[PDB]
Design an enzyme around this catalytic site. Structure first.
Site, mmCIF file in Angstrom:
data_model
loop_
_atom_site.group_PDB
_atom_site.id
_atom_site.type_symbol
_atom_site.label_atom_id
_atom_site.label_comp_id
_atom_site.label_asym_id
_atom_site.label_seq_id
_atom_site.Cartn_x
_atom_site.Cartn_y
_atom_site.Cartn_z
ATOM 1 N N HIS A 46 10.870 112.402 -10.648
ATOM 2 C CA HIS A 46 9.536 111.470 -10.602
ATOM 3 C C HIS A 46 9.564 110.489 -9.585
ATOM 4 O O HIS A 46 8.713 110.223 -9.008
ATOM 5 C CB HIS A 46 9.275 110.735 -12.088
ATOM 6 C CG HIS A 46 9.738 109.509 -11.980
ATOM 7 N ND1 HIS A 46 10.764 109.243 -13.208
ATOM 8 C CD2 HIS A 46 9.738 108.450 -11.373
ATOM 9 C CE1 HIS A 46 11.214 107.850 -13.010
ATOM 10 N NE2 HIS A 46 10.524 107.459 -11.984
ATOM 11 N N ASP A 97 13.431 115.482 -15.898
ATOM 12 C CA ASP A 97 13.281 114.532 -14.768
ATOM 13 C C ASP A 97 14.539 114.426 -13.977
ATOM 14 O O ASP A 97 15.498 113.463 -14.217
ATOM 15 C CB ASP A 97 12.646 113.316 -15.502
ATOM 16 C CG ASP A 97 12.348 112.116 -14.200
ATOM 17 O OD1 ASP A 97 12.070 112.486 -13.183
ATOM 18 O OD2 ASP A 97 12.421 111.010 -14.636
ATOM 19 N N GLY A 196 12.158 100.676 -10.983
ATOM 20 C CA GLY A 196 13.080 100.614 -9.847
ATOM 21 C C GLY A 196 14.471 101.077 -10.516
ATOM 22 O O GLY A 196 15.149 101.201 -9.589
ATOM 23 N N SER A 198 14.904 103.818 -12.141
ATOM 24 C CA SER A 198 14.885 105.153 -12.314
ATOM 25 C C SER A 198 15.616 106.028 -11.357
ATOM 26 O O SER A 198 15.972 105.622 -10.151
ATOM 27 C CB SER A 198 13.339 105.693 -11.901
ATOM 28 O OG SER A 198 12.593 105.238 -12.859
HETATM 29 C C1 LIG Z 1 12.629 103.554 -15.880
HETATM 30 C C2 LIG Z 1 11.333 103.114 -15.786
HETATM 31 C C3 LIG Z 1 10.328 103.517 -14.836
HETATM 32 C C4 LIG Z 1 9.186 102.907 -14.781
HETATM 33 C C5 LIG Z 1 8.257 103.632 -13.436
HETATM 34 O O1 LIG Z 1 7.340 102.799 -13.016
HETATM 35 N N1 LIG Z 1 8.406 105.029 -13.200
HETATM 36 C C6 LIG Z 1 7.431 105.393 -12.404
HETATM 37 C C7 LIG Z 1 7.008 106.888 -12.839
HETATM 38 C C8 LIG Z 1 6.466 107.600 -11.823
HETATM 39 CL CL1 LIG Z 1 5.857 109.233 -11.868
HETATM 40 C C9 LIG Z 1 6.116 106.935 -10.554
HETATM 41 C C10 LIG Z 1 6.526 105.736 -10.277
HETATM 42 N N2 LIG Z 1 6.058 104.903 -8.996
HETATM 43 C C11 LIG Z 1 5.502 103.713 -9.226
HETATM 44 C C12 LIG Z 1 5.409 102.706 -7.884
HETATM 45 C C13 LIG Z 1 4.711 103.722 -6.774
HETATM 46 C C14 LIG Z 1 5.279 105.032 -6.553
HETATM 47 C C15 LIG Z 1 5.410 105.760 -7.882
HETATM 48 C C16 LIG Z 1 7.110 104.973 -11.394
HETATM 49 C C17 LIG Z 1 8.762 102.028 -15.743
HETATM 50 C C18 LIG Z 1 9.435 101.294 -16.269
HETATM 51 C C19 LIG Z 1 9.050 100.353 -17.291
HETATM 52 C C20 LIG Z 1 10.803 101.911 -16.548
HETATM 53 O O2 LIG Z 1 11.550 101.367 -17.460
HETATM 54 C C21 LIG Z 1 11.494 102.059 -18.924
HETATM 55 C C22 LIG Z 1 12.726 101.570 -19.545
HETATM 56 N N3 LIG Z 1 12.704 100.206 -19.986
#
Ligand SMILES: Cc1cc(C(=O)Nc2cc(Cl)cc(N3CCCCC3)c2)cc(C)c1OCCN
Length: 247
Positions: A46, A97, A196, A198
């Site tokens: 992702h 993923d 961030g 991820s």
């Molecule tokens: C691990 C995690 C990831 C994200 C998140 O923003 N994921 C995400 C997925 C996808 Cl498909 C794209 C993005 N990006 C967002 C910023 C601009 C480029 C794309 C970003 C968001 C959250 C809250 C998170 O934590 C969950 C566990 N507490």
């Protein structure tokens, strides 16, 4: 990372910091990753799916800080960016993923291990720690959901593995969580991965060995009660990893 502590690369020497170049010459942080062998970093699909061009990416190893240099750090181009062909995303859940970045210095070499640059072991097939095991996550992700910038210094924290039965309760994630995922959280819901983080590692001690059990993937919010962090379950992807790290 919400909560936890600031750390340095010598404490997480497999951690890889992945950035993307932009037209105009700005570089932004993309996601974390983990060195699984000298030439290969493993991360999350992702992170890349919207910008799948390998030339756009820079990978650092031995790096403790987001926007400044660390002594001993090394910089790599991406020789091959491999995304999972079955990757998909629903409302919350990301499926398959997982991604591979074949790395190489501008001179054509892979990583040279050092005190600050080391590989992390893969798990054996479907071999996972028992639920309730404490494991660590590392990343440059948000320290609070209200943050709009990432911290400058790498962080780590400790979370406990949560059973599928607990995680699949309707008020958690129900059937959105699959057998190819692992949930982990803080019992008091105070520490967690966040945006961030991820692509970075969920490391557990498996049979006396530090093991890449998970890859930060998704969840609802950060450190919210009844909403664990969800991770790609690495032990269910070994044939995929084996096959793509060959030809
Ligand atoms: C691990 C995690 C990831 C994200 C998140 O923003 N994921 C995400 C997925 C996808 Cl498909 C794209 C993005 N990006 C967002 C910023 C601009 C480029 C794309 C970003 C968001 C959250 C809250 C998170 O934590 C969950 C566990 N507490």
């Amino acid at each position: 990372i919400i909560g936890g502590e600031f750390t340095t690369i010598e404490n997480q020497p497999w951690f890889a910091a992945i950035y993307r170049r932009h037209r105009g010459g700005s570089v932004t942080y993309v996601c974390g990753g983990s060195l699984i062998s000298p030439c290969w970093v493993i991360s999350a699909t992702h992170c890349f799916i919207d910008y799948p061009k390998k030339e756009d990416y820079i990978v650092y190893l031995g790096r403790s800080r987001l926007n400044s240099n660390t002594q001993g750090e090394m910089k790599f181009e991406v020789e091959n960016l491999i995304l999972h062909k079955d990757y998909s995303a629903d409302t919350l859940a990301h499926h398959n993923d997982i991604a591979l970045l074949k790395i190489r210095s501008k001179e054509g070499r892979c990583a040279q291990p050092s005190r600050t640059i080391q590989t992390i072991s893969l798990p054996s097939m479907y071999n996972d720690p028992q639920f309730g095991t404490s494991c660590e996550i590392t990343g440059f992700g948000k320290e609070n959901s209200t943050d709009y910038l990432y911290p400058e210094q790498l962080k780590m924290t400790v979370v406990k593995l949560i059973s599928h039965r607990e995680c699949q309760q309707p008020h958690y994630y129900g059937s959105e969580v699959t057998t190819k995922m692992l949930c982990a959280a803080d019992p008091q819901w105070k520490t967690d991965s966040c945006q961030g983080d991820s692509g970075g590692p969920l490391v557990c001690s498996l049979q006396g060995r530090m093991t890449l059990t998970g890859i930060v993937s998704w969840g609802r919010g950060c450190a919210l009660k009844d909403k664990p962090g969800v991770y790609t379950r690495v032990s269910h992807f070994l044939p995929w990893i084996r096959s793509h790290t060959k030809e």
